[PDB]
Design a binder for this molecule. Structure first.
Ligand SMILES: O[C@@H](c1ccccc1)[C@H]1CCCN1
Ligand SMILES: O[C@H](c1ccccc1)[C@@H]1CCCN1
Length: 155
């Protein structure tokens, strides 16, 4: 079904994350963490405090695809377990979908906060307007390995 997914996304904010390599997205998928540049870290911390869900939608540059999406479970924090990224604070994230979506499937979605360009277009950290972001997340193939019960309880 899609009902719990729609519930998690209700009144959410959405941000495009552009990564330079699959290895870092793989690490994020395995460890449930993300780290970004200071300008985006500040924006995400602000969004985390005000919105009931903040959703990161990931895309590896030149892949032509999104690799999935996740919900922030914390603000950024320093001093924790180190992460062997491929070269700020660390956000904890809960994955909602670890399956890919090709850009060809989102060609009908425009992002008002980026001049109504197709939603695949955007710098790392670009905010995606609510309706566009909701519809983008609903386009991903269902990830039947995920149980959103525990995510709902964190809201
Ligand atoms: O956001 C990126 C970045 C690039 C340069 C300086 C700080 C942060 C990368 C780093 C690991 C995962 N995300
Ligand atoms: O998407 C809409 C928009 C965005 C930018 C210019 C005109 C119209 C509005 C914005 C808030 C709610 N929806």
């Amino acid at each position: 079904g899609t009902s719990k997914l729609k519930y998690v996304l209700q009144d959410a904010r959405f941000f495009l994350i552009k990564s330079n390599n699959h290895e870092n997205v793989s690490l994020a998928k395995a460890k449930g963490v993300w780290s970004t540049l200071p300008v985006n870290e500040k924006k995400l911390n602000l969004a985390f405090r005000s919105a009931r869900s903040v959703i990161l939608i990931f895309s590896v540059r030149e892949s032509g695809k999104f690799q999935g999406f996740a919900r922030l479970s914390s603000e950024s924090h320093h001093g924790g377990s180190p992460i062997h990224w491929v070269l700020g604070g660390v956000f904890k994230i809960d994955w909602i979908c670890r399956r890919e979506l090709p850009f060809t499937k989102s060609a009908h979605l425009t992002n008002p906060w980026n001049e109504h360009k197709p939603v695949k277009i955007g710098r790392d950290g670009q905010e995606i307007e609510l309706e566009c972001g909701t519809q983008l997340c609903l386009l991903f193939p269902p990830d039947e390995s995920i149980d959103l019960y525990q995510v709902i309880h964190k809201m």
